[PDB]
């Protein structure tokens, strides 16, 4: 069907930040995405 926006892994930066690494289209996000609630 439709290709849902997702694919969110865990990427920890040296400051201890839980940031997400968009596998969707290869992108980065600091905190929670729109669909990731």
């Amino acid at each position: 069907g439709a290709t849902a926006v997702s694919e969110w892994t865990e990427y920890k930066t040296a400051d201890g930040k839980t940031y997400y690494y968009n596998n969707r289209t290869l992108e980065s996000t600091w905190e929670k995405p729109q669909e990731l609630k």
Binding site: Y11, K12, T13, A14, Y19, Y21, S28, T29, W30
Partner: peptide, 9 residues
């Protein structure tokens, strides 16, 4: 090694 994030507009 981790990537730095890009900033949001």
């Amino acid at each position: 090694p981790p990537p730095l994030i890009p900033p949001p507009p």
